[PDB]
Amino acid sequence: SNRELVVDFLSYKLSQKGYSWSQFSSEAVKQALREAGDEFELRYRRAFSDLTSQLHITPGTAYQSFEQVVNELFRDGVNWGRIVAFFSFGGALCVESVDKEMQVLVSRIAAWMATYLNDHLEPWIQENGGWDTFVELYGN
């Protein structure tokens, strides 16, 4: 479910760069999230490029980089926009790992994302009306 969302979004972002999720490894929610991600990545393309140009991805530091950035993202609280950005960050990390021929990290990044959602974001999501409320507020 959270798993489902992560795989959907990462598959989409990888496909946009011409990569397939399958080589490395509800619908309304997934579509609204895909679309919010596209829009976020445009509106904050500067923040996107700032991140991408400062990622030095290695197997030994990739979890550290994920954690560092995600802790910063939610330092001042959670909102729907920040959750979208969290997905877009996961997408950027996977694309970058494949660029650097560290495709092995893709399935691992997906797992880190699901764990973060399950352990840390779920309480907020549930308190704030669940994913249905996200669709209500930011779908179409």
Where does this chain bind ligand HI0 (CB under 6 A)?
A: 36, 39-40, 43-44, 47-48, 51, 69, 72-73, 79-82, 84-85, 88-89, 92, 138
In three-state secondary structure terms, 24 is coil
When binding is defined by CB under 5 A, the residue of 22, 60, 72, 77 that contacts Cl ion is: 77
Those residues whose C-beta lies under 8 Å from the C-beta of residue 1, and which sit 6 or more positions away, are 26
Shortest Å distance, C-beta 1 to Cl ion: 24
Shortest Å distance, C-beta 120 to ligand HI0: 14
Residue 77 binds what, of ligand HI0, Cl ion, none (CB under 5 to 8 Å, by partner type)? Cl ion
The encoded tokens of residue 23 equal: 């080589």
* Residue number with CB closer to Cl ion (78 or 135): 78
Shortest Å distance, C-beta 12 to Cl ion: 29
Shortest Å distance, C-beta 77 to Cl ion: 4
27 — phi, psi (to 5°)? Answer: -65, -40
Residue 124 binds what, of ligand HI0, Cl ion, none (CB under 5 to 8 Å, by partner type)? none
* Residue number with CB closer to ligand HI0 (70 or 114): 70
Tell me which residue has tokens 């959907």.
8
CA dihedral 105, 47, 124, 113 (to 10 degrees): 0
**Widest Cα–Cα separation across the chain:** 40
Those residues whose C-beta lies under 8 Å from the C-beta of residue 48, and which sit 6 or more positions away, are 41, 88, 92
